[PDB]
Design a protein around this motif. Structure first.
Motif, PDB file in Angstrom:
ATOM      1  N   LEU A 185       1.046  -1.032   0.015  1.00  0.00           N
ATOM      2  CA  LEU A 185       0.041   0.055  -0.045  1.00  0.00           C
ATOM      3  C   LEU A 185       0.825   1.131   0.026  1.00  0.00           C
ATOM      4  N   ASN A 186       0.419   2.112  -0.763  1.00  0.00           N
ATOM      5  CA  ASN A 186       1.315   3.404  -1.007  1.00  0.00           C
ATOM      6  C   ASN A 186       0.334   4.687  -1.280  1.00  0.00           C
ATOM      7  N   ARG A 187       0.647   5.794  -0.567  1.00  0.00           N
ATOM      8  CA  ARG A 187      -0.028   7.083  -0.766  1.00  0.00           C
ATOM      9  C   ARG A 187       1.017   7.898  -1.433  1.00  0.00           C
ATOM     10  N   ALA A 188       0.032   8.839  -1.904  1.00  0.00           N
ATOM     11  CA  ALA A 188       0.629   9.669  -3.050  1.00  0.00           C
ATOM     12  C   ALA A 188       1.740  10.539  -2.499  1.00  0.00           C
ATOM     13  N   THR A 202       4.203  10.285  -0.112  1.00  0.00           N
ATOM     14  CA  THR A 202       5.280   9.475   0.163  1.00  0.00           C
ATOM     15  C   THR A 202       6.268  10.292   0.616  1.00  0.00           C
ATOM     16  N   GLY A 204       5.938   5.590   3.639  1.00  0.00           N
ATOM     17  CA  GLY A 204       4.731   5.719   2.603  1.00  0.00           C
ATOM     18  C   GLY A 204       4.557   4.597   2.055  1.00  0.00           C
ATOM     19  N   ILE A 205       5.360   3.588   1.750  1.00  0.00           N
ATOM     20  CA  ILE A 205       5.106   2.247   1.196  1.00  0.00           C
ATOM     21  C   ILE A 205       5.295   1.303   2.348  1.00  0.00           C
ATOM     22  N   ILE A 248      -7.924  -0.371   6.143  1.00  0.00           N
ATOM     23  CA  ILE A 248      -6.691   0.031   6.827  1.00  0.00           C
ATOM     24  C   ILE A 248      -6.676   0.063   8.086  1.00  0.00           C
ATOM     25  N   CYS A 278      -2.455   4.396  10.000  1.00  0.00           N
ATOM     26  CA  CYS A 278      -2.702   5.428   9.297  1.00  0.00           C
ATOM     27  C   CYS A 278      -1.673   6.761   9.697  1.00  0.00           C
ATOM     28  N   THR A 279      -1.414   7.054  10.731  1.00  0.00           N
ATOM     29  CA  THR A 279      -0.539   8.357  10.697  1.00  0.00           C
ATOM     30  C   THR A 279       0.834   8.213  10.362  1.00  0.00           C
ATOM     31  N   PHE A 304       1.244   6.985   7.154  1.00  0.00           N
ATOM     32  CA  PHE A 304       1.063   7.434   5.891  1.00  0.00           C
ATOM     33  C   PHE A 304       0.514   8.900   5.906  1.00  0.00           C
ATOM     34  N   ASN A 305       0.123   9.677   6.795  1.00  0.00           N
ATOM     35  CA  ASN A 305      -0.446  11.093   6.724  1.00  0.00           C
ATOM     36  C   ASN A 305      -1.644  10.944   6.179  1.00  0.00           C
TER      37      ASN A 305
END
Length: 48
Positions: free
Chosen positions: A13-16, A18, A23-24, A39, A44-45, A47-48
């Motif tokens: 899982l990866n957020r934009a 990063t 982030g990954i 999730i 969560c925190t 990944f922000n």
DNA sequence: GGCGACCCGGCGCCCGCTACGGAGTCAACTACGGGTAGGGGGTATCGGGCAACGCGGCACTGAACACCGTTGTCATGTGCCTTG
């Protein structure tokens, strides 16, 4: 068959944004109804 | 006349992904000449459809011999009777 095959196979899982290396993050997938990713609230925190 | 500012050009960049609209636009002409390309016309060449005819096992052809088996057969040997 999908329920059988996904187990013991990681997915990243990866957020934009990063911003940093957390982030990954790999996870164990798990089939679930609906159409949105579930999730864990603890991760969560990171990944922000 | 190299320093000096300043001036100017000239350039360099300017978080991340998905996901999220369309739109598309103003001023020549004709004559020739060839050559390619199309069309149909006709023609040599390749490809598809059928029963004999290659085979082979064996089978019949028994025909013609062979293989034992058999009761044909013969001229030639014992046992009793008659006479030396």
């Amino acid at each position: 068959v999908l329920e059988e095959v996904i187990a013991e196979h990681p997915v990243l899982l990866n957020r934009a944004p990063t911003l940093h290396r957390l982030g990954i993050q790999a996870f164990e997938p798990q089939l679930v109804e609906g159409k949105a990713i579930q999730i864990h609230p603890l991760v969560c925190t990171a990944f922000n």
